[PDB]
Each structure stands twice: as structure tokens, then as C-alpha cells.
Symmetry: D2
Amino acid sequence: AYRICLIEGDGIGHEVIPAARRVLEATGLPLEFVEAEAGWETFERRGTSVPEETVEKILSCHATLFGAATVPGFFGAIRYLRRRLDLYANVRPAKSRPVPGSRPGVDLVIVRENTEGLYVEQERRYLDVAIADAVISKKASERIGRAALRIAEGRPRKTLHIAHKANVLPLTQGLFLDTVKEVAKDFPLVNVQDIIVDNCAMQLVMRPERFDVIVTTNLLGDILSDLAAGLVGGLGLAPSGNIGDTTAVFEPVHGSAIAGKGIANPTAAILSAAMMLDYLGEKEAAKRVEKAVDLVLERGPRTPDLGGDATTEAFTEAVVEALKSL
Amino acid sequence: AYRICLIEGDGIGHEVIPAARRVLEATGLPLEFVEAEAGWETFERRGTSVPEETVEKILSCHATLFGAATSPTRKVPGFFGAIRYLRRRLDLYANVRPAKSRPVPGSRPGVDLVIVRENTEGLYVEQERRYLDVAIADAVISKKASERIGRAALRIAEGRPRKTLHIAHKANVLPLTQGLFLDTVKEVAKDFPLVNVQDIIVDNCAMQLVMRPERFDVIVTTNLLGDILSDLAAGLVGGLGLAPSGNIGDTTAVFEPVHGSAPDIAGKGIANPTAAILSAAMMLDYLGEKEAAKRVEKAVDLVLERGPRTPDLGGDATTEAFTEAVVEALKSL
Amino acid sequence: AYRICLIEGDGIGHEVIPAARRVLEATGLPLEFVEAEAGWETFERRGTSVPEETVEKILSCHATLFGAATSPTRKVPGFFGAIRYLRRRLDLYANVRPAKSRPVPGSRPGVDLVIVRENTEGLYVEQERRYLDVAIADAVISKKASERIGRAALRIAEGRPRKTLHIAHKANVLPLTQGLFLDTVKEVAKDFPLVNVQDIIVDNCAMQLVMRPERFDVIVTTNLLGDILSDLAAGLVGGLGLAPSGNIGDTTAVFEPVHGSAPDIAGKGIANPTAAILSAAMMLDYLGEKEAAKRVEKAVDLVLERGPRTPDLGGDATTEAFTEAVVEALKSL
Amino acid sequence: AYRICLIEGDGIGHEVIPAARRVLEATGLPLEFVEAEAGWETFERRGTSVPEETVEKILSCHATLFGAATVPGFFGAIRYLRRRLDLYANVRPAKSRPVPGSRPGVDLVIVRENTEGLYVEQERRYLDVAIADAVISKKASERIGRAALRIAEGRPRKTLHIAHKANVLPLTQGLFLDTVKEVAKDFPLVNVQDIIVDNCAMQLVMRPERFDVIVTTNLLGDILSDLAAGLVGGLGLAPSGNIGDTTAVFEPVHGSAIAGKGIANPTAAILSAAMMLDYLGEKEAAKRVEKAVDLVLERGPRTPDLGGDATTEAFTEAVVEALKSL
């Protein structure tokens, strides 16, 4: 059976992760769970955001699902995990959901590298001048390009756009662009197009339907993904994954927010669980989960963040029920 | 009188600059035009995209209006971008890019903002280097550069109705560079108590621009962030076809359309002069002729709404017909 | 009276500092000594090599005399070099290292120079970074740092008989960094017309120091170059065993022997206090007691020449015997 | 036979290179020569310090001997050759010569990397702050370490000192040190010692006999070699080599200086020719040349730079004669 490590994290995480677990069990898949701790609240009790035991648990499982995160000695749990486990592929999908305030027809995935697994981009200040290093290496570019190509090859469109800034940064961005295009020769089935990041941002706003998979570098991926989230309902419903060569951690994009009341929308956590299923090779199960979520978002109840007043537990129940009817 | 340097540039620049000139002349303001050459076509004839005489003419005028520049696919030895060169040579550090709703197909209503970011090359070229399999690009922030750009943005904000400024940054991930930028602008902001200043992480700014663009007026940010935010904003209003822009320094400024030279349609007389005319309006504002600038903008909006419309806006009218309509409209506004 | 902070440090520091104190007391000058702790032994007991109280005591005195610091082979978490920390914390930017002939075995005659280089950490730590198989180290030069160090060296040169200063640089290969350094020092040199200033490529300086050291008096250079030039110069005069040094800032200074703590002989009473005594002489010079400084140096030279000599100089005398001889000699000089 | 490319260069080069050629012929070895042009004087006539034809000639020969070198469009010939041909190993020996003003018993070789074959260390200035990059890579360190180890293995002492600054620059200098020591495992016959560069400088002054082969990085090698030259007679008699994986260029260390009169000391050029012979595998011939040079420096005439008044041509004749008697 699949071993899934569950980490609630802080605040709303305590509500959306158990919800995600519920939906996962509803799929009927042979699943096992291992609870672990991480985050600010874990720091206050353990002295560290990511206890050594947590890393061990993560490594003992096929995949990890993380809820949310919210001083000397403290460090970002997710940032630490990316570096410690070299989860180099940051995967952020943007898909139209049947919710008021969402552009229809949008269905893309943005892939960018999590650099710290290989190196930390250093900042330095000398008197009145501060300098930040933007680093691109052939190795890192080959890895993320191959990761993006595989993702595109597993999607209907078989289309990949390389969003770059080689026009103004020929050495760094050019190395990125050229390397991804080189790796692309190994994926003749994938249609690869190059696009300046600025133009990509404008086209995401004007006609996002144009994109399927987009691969880009660090700082650019961030803004493009947030721009895209703005088009389909905000970060509130956005799932994400951090995939390495041995394991992966999935989590909602938005912070830990409210909370405690039980009005947190578990959509992102559930869709992150769906991303995890896809990653594990259970694509059909992932599609059913996603469908069930859409059905509820469309007809079923709705949590506060979506105009409704339904509770996290109520919304989750509907999904479970809907999932069972599919 | 005001001395205005006119540089047509390449392709459609030869059509939209003369059109913008006509609109400026229609204001009746005391303007003396000085023509100069710059661009790819100029390079092909002189070995440089920006002759020394052109720099001299720009410096001899109050402001400059530039058309378009052709950028060849492959790199041509000796050829460098004219606007990039002028930004550096004259230290036109304030890159000003408005994003505003227009009465045209595809433009979302309720958008009226201005994004301000620095052009760094007047002070320093951010260097790139490659060592074997590793390439590194410097992102440079200095107190001096941040103070200047912050003050420029605050001045623009104070000159607008909303008196609102947002500082878009990434100090959450780049505390030393982005933090220096943020802290410095906030420091200069103390001198502009009439302007409501708010800080916003660039990523969140991007999302909010797509969801609630009406919350912004003036946004000041750094190098690469401004680029993407402006293109994002342009997407909301239909694209870059009608967008004007400015590069302002301490002693002069150059204004120009964001759109390229469109070589394949140059000479056909169908280019939309809106961007060039609105760039001329930005120039009038800069020169202190704010009322005339507003009238020019109103004339443009009236024609955009009622026609004649050039091909890019779904019409079949010529550059000439459009220009004459703006000139005629201006007289009654 | 002059407030002097005494920090024995580790190992032989416990023997040479008290000796230097005795020599200072032998001058009869109005000196008030304030003891403070710093070093490895201090770290082992307090978790820090430089307690806050020590920094406070240093700041409360006119100058500080430091003995020696033990540097363990392997890196010990939490332990940092005391002198390095003080240079940074108090911005003791002027690293002053004299190289002078002494009447001892192995010392070449005719050497009398002072090498001045900046300690950069008071302004900034030059960062290193590694990306995969490539490592990069920043060599940083600023106008501010160069102006300060240049002025410090020029002041030292003007306070010496020869009134001669050489600027050792590598602007021939590093025009931007080394050139900024060179040009800046030459600019400040304009204010010292009494000092004869010459520029010299560091490589040539190294060669000339070995062949004709008498041509130099004061040499000002950058970070890593000063290090090697001083050790080269030390080689000419017998080594680093008798060498004093100073770290001078705008408000105070710390002087100390270049020699280490020699842990294995600590407590045996055979350490040569020459370096510590000469460091005390540098301190007197710095404090404005130039005549006393010269007398202390003469007393040291007399004993070095006639004995008693400690083991390091081929003798079999104790630290105590040597110190008493210097004290007695000082009275007649 | 061996094909040797001869490049006189500027000034004194016109006198010392023909002299070196003379001594080479005197060895009796099957030699052939190919004249090429390079330098300032070549720039004034060709428009470039290193004509393309010169590079072609160099590549067509087993080794190259260069005399000396002395504005937009102009660039250092030697610097260009190092980069163009990737002559990464800069070899500079320091040996006591029987001349007044030379410390006896000194016999060492300093090896440092010529970096530009792989990359140019960039300088940058931002307002009042200037920054220069000091770059160390595993590849460059492995190459120069192996080069230094081979040189030490071919010498009696079988001793190598790695002069570094890892104490204050742990990342760059530490990578250098660690990499050379790793490559050293492949040379169990060579005794390898580590030494801080500052201490190395002091020990070169106090007791240079301690050293045989010294391997160090860029900026340090320069000063150590000039320091060493100061101990054995100055740069005037110092030879040098720039060795790559396919070819090598040898030349006197000192500039092009005087000249025209014919009072230039051809010692450095001749010893550089000796270094070249060693490089070609003619060690015995190289030793004879060196011996002949010493014999003349000791008893025979002496050029102005050495107190004497002998001419370049006279000094050379003596060496040839002396070489013939050996």
C-alpha cells in the first residue's frame, strides 16, 4: 500500500489536512498514514520547525502532504525540506474552477526550480550598495527542464512554453533557455515554444488558454503563478507540489490564514492530495477527487471564502459523498 | 517656446511621430520642433544607432518624443538599442509606464495606474558572468538609486487625484537588496505626508492587479519586477498597442510608444498613432502643460470610442484619417 | 592619566603582557591599567572569546594592549578570533605592521619600514560563495575605505624622518578595484605635500623588498597584499618572533605581538616579551608619548644586543631576567 | 625532428631569441624552426598583437619560444595566447646562479594556473564600490595540481608544497587545497605539504632551500615568484613556461626593457629554451644548456646587467662554445 506522511502544520492546517485525509480514504485506495510535525507551532514546542524525526518519517513514506505554515533558531519548514531533500521541482497548477470570479477554460501548470537543494543564492551588502546573485547552472536547468517536459508529455496538449528573459540576461537566462531546449530534443512528442516572461505575463491575462505547461526560473515562476492564481480564484484554492528524485511534498499555496472556527476551505489541501495521487501513479483516482471537488464547488455548499457559509467539515463531507457517487 | 526633439526612429515611427506632431501643433502651444535620427535604419547608414548630433539635439531641447526602433533577430556587431543607449548616456533613471483603460475592444474598465521603476544603466550596468557550468547575474540596489526613484514616484503620485503609492518589493526573500529599496523609499516618503504609501510584496501585487486593479494608482518597484507588472497591467487593458511610456532624468526626458517598429507594415499608412500621441501627452504633462495634456488624452479617447478606427482596433481607417479626427476633436475639448 | 586596557589573552600572553606592563611602568608615565579577558581560555569559560565587558573596558580606555590568542586546529562552534572580532566591532581599520632590523641573529641590517593595510570587516565582510564546482571570493575596494587607509598611512609617513610613502597595488591587472584604491590614495596624498609618494606594482615591491629594503619607509596596500609583504619583510629581519603590530580606528586602538600563544611553553617563564614590549612602544607613540616610545625601543635593542637573551634568541635567560634588564636599561636611556 | 616556433616579440626580444636559437642549434639536436610574429610592434604593422597566422604556426610546432612584449584594438600577446590555447600551467623556476647577488642552494619551481583558458575573472564597479572576483573551480584545481605533481615527480626531491590561504578563504582556497590533495593520492611518491602563502613568503626569504615545487593559485603565484626572483638575481635571468595539454610557450619573465645596443642578457631566453627542451623530452640537452650558461655566468664574460660590459652576441658565443665543450 502507499505510505503517506501527513503534516498538519499551523493554523488552518489542522482543519484542511484531516479533511484531505478523509477524501483520500474515500478513494478506496490501499493507503497508510504517518503523522509528522512541522511549522511555527512545532518550533515553539520542539525548538525547531522541522524535527529530525519528521524528516525520517517523510523519507519512510512515498509522499508527504503538508497543511500550512505561519525569530532566532526558527526557519521555514517548507524551505528547509526543499533543501534537505532537494525537492527541486516546484509544480503549481492553475485551473479554472466552477466558482464565481474564475476565468473559464484555463488549464496550465507552471514549473520552476527550487534552487536551495543545490545552492543558496547569496545576498551581500557593501556600504550603500546591495547585490543579490541570480544563479543558473546547466545541471539545475537540465533537471527542471526534464521535469517540465515529462509533465507536459503526460498531458493532452503535449505543449511546453519556456518563459525566459534571455533577451536582457543572455548569460544566465540564455543558459537556462538553451539547456531546456537541448533536453527537449529527447521529447520529440512535446511541442516546445520559447516566450519572454513579460509577454507570458501579458498573455496569461489576455488569453491563458494558450498555455499548458510553462517552465521558468526562480523569481519569474513566483509572479507568473500568482498572476495565474488571480485568474482562477486566487491562492485560496491553489495546490502545489515540491518534487525531488526520491520523494515529494504537496501543500496548499496560501498561508495558514481565521482558522480554529472551521470555515477554512479544504479545496487546496484536497487538490494537493490529488496532485499527490497523480504523482504516485493513481491518475484515475486523482481525476475522481478533482471531479468531486468541482461538483461541490459548482452545486454543493460553499465555505465563507466563496460567499457561502458552509464549514470545512460540511464541505469535506459533500466531497466525500460526491466522490463516492463517482 | 518649448524645444521638442522629434526622433521618428524606424518603420511606423515615420508615420506615428508626424501624427503626434500634428496633434501637438493642434494645441496651439509655442513649440519648436527639432528633428534628429536614431535607430536601426540610422545604424545602417552611420555605423551607430545614436549619432552624437542626436544626443546633442536631445540635450538642447526640453523633451524628446521617440517613435519606434527595429530590433533585428540576430545580433549585429556595432548595433545597440537606441533607447537603452539614451537611458544610460543621459541617465534617464525613471521608467514611467501608465496602464489605463481605453474605450476599445478588450480593455477592462476601471484601470488607471502608473508603474515606475528605475533604469539602472545611468549609474551602472548590472553585470553577468559565466564560469564553466555556472552563470551569475547581479541584481543591484543602492541607496542613491532607490532614493531617486522613490522620490520620482512620490512626485507622480502627488500630482495625481488619488495621492496613492504602493511599493512593490520582495524584501521577504531578498532582505538586503529588496529591503534596502523598501526602507529607502519609505524614508523619502516621510517628505510626502499627502501621499498614502503602502508596501506590498510583488507577488501579491501581481495577483491583486488581476483581481482588483482599481485599488492601485502609482506603483514603484525595482528593475525586473516593474517589467512584468506593466505587461500584466497592459494585458488588462487590451495589450501594448496603445501604450505610451517615458524615461525621465533630472534635466530632460524621452517619451515613446511601447510598441515596436512593425517593419512589415511601415509605409502602408495604417499604423495606430494613439501610443505616440499619448506619449506626446505624457510629455506635455512633464513639461508643465497639464491641461493641454488632459485635452489631448480626451481627444484620443473620443476618437477611440467613436472612430475612425485603424485596423488594429477592428476598423479600416488610415493613420491619416485617425490623426485628423483627433486634431478636430481636440479643438472642442 | 592614560587609561590602558590590558588583555593577556592565552598562553604566553600571561607572561609577556605583565612584562610589557612593567616596562611601561618603568617610564614613570601616568598610566592607569584596566585588565580585561579575551581569547580561547576565556571562551572555554564564558562561551565567547570576547565578553561584552571586555568591549566596554576597551572603549573606556585610550588604548589596549593584547597578548596572544590560541587558535585550535579544528573549528569549535561558537568560538571566533578575538582580534578579528574587535577589528570588526570597533572598526579598527588601520592594520599597522612595522618591520625593523634588530641586533639579533638572522636579522638583516638596514631595514626600517611600516606596512599599512586595511582591516575591512569594520565596514563589510568580503563574502565567499560556492555554486556546485565553482567557488567565488569577493575582493572589495571602496572609495571610503581607500580614503581612510590612505590618510592613515600618510599620517604615519609624515610622522617619520624619511617622509616617504609607496602605494603597492595591482591596478595593471585589476584596473577597477586596485585602480580605485590607487587613485583614491593619490588624491588624499595631495593634502600631504611634505610626503614623497610613489606608486609601485606589488610584485615589483616584493622583489625590491628582498633586494633593496632600504628604499622603503611606509608602504600602504590592500588586504591580501599587505599580509604577504609583511611576512616577506619579517623574513628579512629574522621572522615574526619579535614583531609588534597595531589595529587603529578613529577613536581607539589595539596593539599586540604577531606571535601566537605558544601553549606548550606557557607558564615556563621563557617567552620572549620583546614583541609585547615593542607593541607597548607602538601604543605610546599612538598616544602621543613619542619620546617615551623611542626610549622603550632603545632599551629593548640594548638588551637584545647585550643580553640576557631568552631561548628563542640562542640564550638561556628567563622572561623575568630579560624584562628586568629592559627596565634597568630604560632608566639610563 | 622537433618543430620550434620562434617569436622575437618587441625590443630586446630581437636580440635574445636569435641568441637562444643559436644555443639550441649548438645542442646538435634535430631541430627545425618556424618564425612567427607577436607583440606591440606586430600590432603597429598588422593591427593585432597576435595575427591568426601566428596562432596557426604555433599549433603546427611542438613548442614555441617567445622573446618579449612591450590603446584600442591592442591586447597582450601572451595573455591572448594563454586563453586562445588554454596554456593553463604557468611554470616559473627560481634557481641560484653563479652571479654576485644570488642566494646559493636555491632550486625551486612555482606552478600556478593561467585562468583565462577557462574563464576571465570579472571586475565590476557600482558607484563607490568595486568588486573583483577570485574564482576557484574543481576542474581548474585538479588540472594545475596534476601538472605540479608531475613536475615534482620528475625532480630529485619529489617534494611539493601547496601554498594556500584556506585559513581566511575556506570556500575558494579550501576547494583549491582539498582538490590538489585529492589528486595527490595518485602520486604516492611525491611528498606533499600544505603551507599558508604568507608563511611560504617568509620561508622563501629565510630558508628557500626548503622548497622544491610549489603549487599555488593566481595572484599568490605572482608575488611568490617575484619574491623568489629577488633571491637569485632578479627577473633578468628568470625563464618561464606556459604549458597546455597540446603545446606550450616559453619566454623570459622580464619585459622588453635599453635594447638595440646588443647589451641585453640572453640568459633568460636561453634558460627558457632549456625549459622547452625539458618539456620536449630532451632533459639531457636541457641540462647541458643550463650548465653551459652557468659556466659562462661564473667564469666567462658578463653583460652590463651583471656588472660586465660584454655584448649579447659575445655572451651567446661563450655559451655556444662552452656548450660544445660539454
